Design an enzyme around this catalytic site. Structure first.
Site, PDB file in Angstrom:
ATOM      1  N   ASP A  91       0.862  -1.180   0.000  1.00  0.00           N
ATOM      2  CA  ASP A  91       0.000   0.000   0.000  1.00  0.00           C
ATOM      3  C   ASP A  91       0.899   1.230   0.000  1.00  0.00           C
ATOM      4  O   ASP A  91       1.733   1.434   0.923  1.00  0.00           O
ATOM      5  CB  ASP A  91      -0.797  -0.125   1.334  1.00  0.00           C
ATOM      6  CG  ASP A  91      -1.731   1.034   1.311  1.00  0.00           C
ATOM      7  OD1 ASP A  91      -2.783   0.872   0.635  1.00  0.00           O
ATOM      8  OD2 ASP A  91      -1.477   2.172   1.757  1.00  0.00           O
ATOM      9  N   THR A 145       0.143   4.440   0.623  1.00  0.00           N
ATOM     10  CA  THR A 145       0.033   5.413   1.725  1.00  0.00           C
ATOM     11  C   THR A 145       0.848   4.892   2.905  1.00  0.00           C
ATOM     12  O   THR A 145       1.433   5.698   3.618  1.00  0.00           O
ATOM     13  CB  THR A 145      -1.417   5.536   2.240  1.00  0.00           C
ATOM     14  OG1 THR A 145      -2.218   5.617   1.056  1.00  0.00           O
ATOM     15  CG2 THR A 145      -1.605   6.757   3.114  1.00  0.00           C
ATOM     16  N   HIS A 203       5.235   5.691   6.272  1.00  0.00           N
ATOM     17  CA  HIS A 203       6.363   5.060   6.980  1.00  0.00           C
ATOM     18  C   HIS A 203       7.669   5.842   6.799  1.00  0.00           C
ATOM     19  O   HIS A 203       8.396   6.206   7.750  1.00  0.00           O
ATOM     20  CB  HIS A 203       6.423   3.596   6.432  1.00  0.00           C
ATOM     21  CG  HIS A 203       7.672   2.941   6.900  1.00  0.00           C
ATOM     22  ND1 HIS A 203       7.765   2.329   8.126  1.00  0.00           N
ATOM     23  CD2 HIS A 203       8.875   2.907   6.293  1.00  0.00           C
ATOM     24  CE1 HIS A 203       8.986   1.881   8.346  1.00  0.00           C
ATOM     25  NE2 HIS A 203       9.596   2.215   7.228  1.00  0.00           N
ATOM     26  N   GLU A 204       8.028   6.055   5.516  1.00  0.00           N
ATOM     27  CA  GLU A 204       9.243   6.830   5.202  1.00  0.00           C
ATOM     28  C   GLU A 204       9.244   8.220   5.816  1.00  0.00           C
ATOM     29  O   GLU A 204      10.271   8.690   6.292  1.00  0.00           O
ATOM     30  CB  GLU A 204       9.438   6.868   3.684  1.00  0.00           C
ATOM     31  CG  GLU A 204       9.785   5.522   3.059  1.00  0.00           C
ATOM     32  CD  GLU A 204      10.909   4.693   3.692  1.00  0.00           C
ATOM     33  OE1 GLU A 204      11.922   5.189   4.178  1.00  0.00           O
ATOM     34  OE2 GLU A 204      10.751   3.452   3.734  1.00  0.00           O
ATOM     35  N   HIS A 245      10.449   8.417   9.368  1.00  0.00           N
ATOM     36  CA  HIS A 245      11.907   8.560   9.549  1.00  0.00           C
ATOM     37  C   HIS A 245      12.408   9.989   9.650  1.00  0.00           C
ATOM     38  O   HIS A 245      13.275  10.315  10.475  1.00  0.00           O
ATOM     39  CB  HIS A 245      12.653   7.939   8.356  1.00  0.00           C
ATOM     40  CG  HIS A 245      12.579   6.457   8.517  1.00  0.00           C
ATOM     41  ND1 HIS A 245      12.755   5.808   9.738  1.00  0.00           N
ATOM     42  CD2 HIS A 245      12.328   5.530   7.553  1.00  0.00           C
ATOM     43  CE1 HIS A 245      12.629   4.521   9.584  1.00  0.00           C
ATOM     44  NE2 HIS A 245      12.416   4.434   8.315  1.00  0.00           N
ATOM     45  N   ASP A 263      13.439   2.306  12.145  1.00  0.00           N
ATOM     46  CA  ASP A 263      12.837   1.082  11.617  1.00  0.00           C
ATOM     47  C   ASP A 263      12.682   0.004  12.692  1.00  0.00           C
ATOM     48  O   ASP A 263      13.568  -0.079  13.553  1.00  0.00           O
ATOM     49  CB  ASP A 263      13.790   0.400  10.616  1.00  0.00           C
ATOM     50  CG  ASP A 263      13.724   1.061   9.255  1.00  0.00           C
ATOM     51  OD1 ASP A 263      12.549   0.876   8.901  1.00  0.00           O
ATOM     52  OD2 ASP A 263      14.592   1.659   8.608  1.00  0.00           O
TER      53      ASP A 263
HETATM   54 CA   LIG Z   1      -3.859   3.400   0.965  1.00  0.00          CA
HETATM   55 ZN   LIG Z   2      11.915   2.431   7.313  1.00  0.00          ZN
END
Ligand SMILES: [Ca+2]
Ligand SMILES: [Zn+2]
Length: 132
Positions: free
Chosen positions: A76, A78, A83-84, A87, A93
């Site tokens: 997915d 989004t 997630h990125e 950071h 992570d």
């Molecule tokens: Ca999505």
């Molecule tokens: Zn990551």
């Protein structure tokens, strides 16, 4: 509330996911807000990298995020994007965590589509930005 400015202009194929990711983060935390604008703190780029998407960042609002085409089609987008962006906000992570942990990233596999940070993730971002 600290405002971190981003530039999404060099990732034309992901404009709605970036806007979606920024909103998820803005709707989840209190001490920092993401906004698109000039003189940006961090930027988004797109292309092909068989390692997937990644973030080049100091962990406190600056640098850039590279979004890979294959990873964003198989997982997915989004969740990938949010997630990125985690950071750049300072979270590390944690690949062994469950799908409910946004920072487990691809660990849970492509069946995991949740783009939201859990209560612990939100709490840690608020603490990292409490004093700017
Ligand atoms: Ca999505
Ligand atoms: Zn990551």
């Amino acid at each position: 509330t600290v405002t971190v400015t981003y530039d999404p202009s060099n990732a034309p194929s992901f404009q709605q996911e970036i806007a979606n990711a920024a909103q998820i983060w803005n709707s989840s935390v209190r001490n920092v807000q993401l906004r698109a604008g000039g003189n940006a703190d961090f930027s988004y780029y797109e292309g092909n990298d068989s390692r997937g998407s990644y973030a080049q960042t100091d962990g406190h609002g600056r640098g850039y995020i590279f979004l890979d085409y294959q990873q964003n089609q198989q997982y997915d987008s989004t969740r990938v994007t949010a997630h990125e962006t985690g950071h750049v906000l300072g979270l590390p992570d944690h690949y062994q965590g469950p799908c409910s942990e946004l920072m487990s990233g691809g660990g849970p596999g492509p069946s995991c589509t949740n783009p939201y940070p859990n209560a612990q993730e939100r709490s840690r971002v608020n603490a990292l930005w409490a004093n700017g």
